[PDB]
């Protein structure tokens, strides 16, 4: 009577369509706050004057 | 039908001049002490 377990499994079968294949998504959440920014890029670090 | 009445007396199309008739409520928006 419409109280089915909402948890369902993905069907990643070889016979499914292109729109149903598994796609690994990776979401990197970048943000700059008042804390010291430790995550940087390959930028050369320089001294101070 | 396509038959005209025999009692119809052919006369010109007389007319008149309406003074201020033809007024109605254009909308249901209520107001007071204004000329909308």
């Amino acid at each position: 009577f419409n109280c089915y377990f909402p948890l369902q499994s993905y069907g990643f079968q070889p016979t499914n369509g292109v729109g149903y294949q598994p796609y690994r998504v990776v979401v990197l959440s970048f943000e700059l706050l008042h804390a010291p920014a430790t995550v940087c890029g390959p930028k050369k670090s320089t001294n101070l004057v | 039908q396509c038959v005209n009445l025999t009692t119809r007396t052919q006369l010109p199309p007389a007319y008149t001049n309406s003074f201020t008739r033809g007024v109605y409520y254009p909308d249901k928006v209520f107001r007071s002490s204004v000329l909308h």
Binding site: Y10, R24, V26, V27, A35, V39 | -
Partner: protein, 49 residues
């Protein structure tokens, strides 16, 4: 050439037709109940079949 405070890489798999649902401020089946990507997301989104 930029630094950031922290970076959280949300790694998960979705279907091909569900890729359009995962986005900043986007609604959908998995977007509303499973993985809500916020509207102020200033990071990056990577996907791979």
């Amino acid at each position: 050439d930029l630094c950031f405070t922290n970076v959280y890489a949300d790694s998960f798999v979705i279907r091909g037709d569900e890729v359009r649902q995962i986005a900043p401020g986007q609604t959908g089946k998995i977007a509303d109940y499973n993985y809500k990507l916020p509207d102020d997301f200033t990071g990056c989104v990577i996907a791979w079949n």
